[PDB]
């Protein structure tokens, strides 16, 4: 009997742009890029959901305004799973740590940048800040794309594998192959 462990799932992380960017005029300026990022992230989330459906049939602090709109969507349904969880948490923690950076601005908050600095320079400053946070989210989206491709390949492999006795596991499955 040989035991093998296959990842099936990854934590669904959706982003709402309305409080991630923010007035409601910054949303009009910066909504397109964040809309592509949000659409890619919900594509990743729906991909993970049908991965679980096909195979089977900051996360501690979150369990939304405190995290700048960076939420975790709960799904409707031992080494490799530990890497999946650890690098997912590393990606999310790196993202949260990177929103805390000022990104070269006079401050990392939107209240102070409209307070002690003039509007015709504040427009450039706020552009730098919000577009930098959006590029950080772009880097997170790219990492989730490549990792979602990896767990996608593993999920189709597990679906083709589904004598053998299966058991559920956190974000994955385990197979007992009797031979």
């Amino acid at each position: 009997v040989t035991t093998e462990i296959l990842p099936v799932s990854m934590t669904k992380t959706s982003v709402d742009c309305t409080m991630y960017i923010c007035c409601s005029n910054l949303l009009l300026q910066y909504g397109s890029f964040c809309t592509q990022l949000n659409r890619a992230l919900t594509g990743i989330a729906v991909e993970q959901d049908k991965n679980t459906q096909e195979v089977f049939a900051f996360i501690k602090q979150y369990g939304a305004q405190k995290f700048n709109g960076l939420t975790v969507l709960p799904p409707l349904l031992l080494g490799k799973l530990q890497d999946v969880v650890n690098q997912n948490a590393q990606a999310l923690n790196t993202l949260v740590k990177q929103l805390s950076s000022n990104f070269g601005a006079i401050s990392s908050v939107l209240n102070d940048i409209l307070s002690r600095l003039d509007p015709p320079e504040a427009e450039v400053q706020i552009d730098r800040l919000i577009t930098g946070r959006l590029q950080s989210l772009q880097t997170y989206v790219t990492q989730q794309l490549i990792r979602a491709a990896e767990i996608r390949a593993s999920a189709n492999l597990a679906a083709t594998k589904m004598m053998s006795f299966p058991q559920s596991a956190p974000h994955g499955v385990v197979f007992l192959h009797v031979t």
Epitope: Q29, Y30, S32, F33, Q36, Q98, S101, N102, F103, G104, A105, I106, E121, E123, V124, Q125, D127, R128, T131, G132, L134, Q135, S136, Q138, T139
Partner: antibody, heavy 122, light 106 residues
């Protein structure tokens, strides 16, 4: 791969304006940045200005304030430069560069464009 | 804005350093200094990003560092291909990028 390609050369006379176009391919034109930097022949690079494709807010240098208007067209992924009121000192190669992914403050110009020679003389 | 030496020379095969001196508002403020190589007749190519990091397609002989209001590039083992224009840059408090002068390593 990512490539930035420019239009042809211009032999615009003094008093006119340029329409130097920068087509960006291989990457999402929404996001990142499009900077314009000119180089006079025989001298070093001096900056002109950056446009952000998301918001169309500019940042010119203090020398080029009021004469240069960067416009972006995200449908064709192309950044137009309009340097109005040319003089004889504006004969230069007008490079189009792309700022890289910003981590902990602003970063380098990861890819550079082709060379547009704008010569201005009688 | 950034002050650099006009040109530098040297025989092939040894280490030579070029500098990049600026004010406290653009290097001393903590902004990343970047270095660029321009071969004659072509667009300048990325040489050093992130002040010490090295991108792909470029060998390890190029190196860079900062200290306070200064930055420095060094080449180890120079050859007949490395004679090209070099530039340094930094961002300021208005986040307006400033290029240094052209250094003619010849």
């Amino acid at each position: 791969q990512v490539q930035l390609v420019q239009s042809g050369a211009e032999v615009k006379k003094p008093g006119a304006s340029v329409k130097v176009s920068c087509k960006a391919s291989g990457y999402t034109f929404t996001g990142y940045y499009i900077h314009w930097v000119r180089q006079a022949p025989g001298q070093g690079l001096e900056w002109m200005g950056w446009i952000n494709p998301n918001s169309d807010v500019t940042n010119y240098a203090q020398k080029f304030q009021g004469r240069v208007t960067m416009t972006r067209d995200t449908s064709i992924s192309t950044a137009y430069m309009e340097l109005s009121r040319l003089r004889s000192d504006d004969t230069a190669v007008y490079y189009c560069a792309r700022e890289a992914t910003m981590i902990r403050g602003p970063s380098d110009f990861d890819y550079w464009g082709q060379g547009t020679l704008v010569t201005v003389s009688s | 804005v950034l002050s650099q030496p006009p040109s530098v020379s040297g025989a092939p095969g040894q280490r030579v350093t070029i500098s990049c001196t600026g004010s406290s508002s653009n290097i001393g403020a903590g902004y990343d200094v970047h270095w660029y190589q321009q071969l004659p007749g072509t667009a300048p190519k990325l040489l050093i990003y992130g002040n010490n990091n090295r991108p792909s397609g470029v060998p390890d002989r190029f190196s860079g560092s900062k200290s306070g209001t200064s930055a420095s590039l060094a080449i180890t083992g120079l050859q007949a291909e490395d004679e090209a224009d070099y530039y340094c840059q930094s961002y300021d408090r208005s986040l307006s990028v400033v290029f240094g002068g052209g250094t003619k390593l010849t």
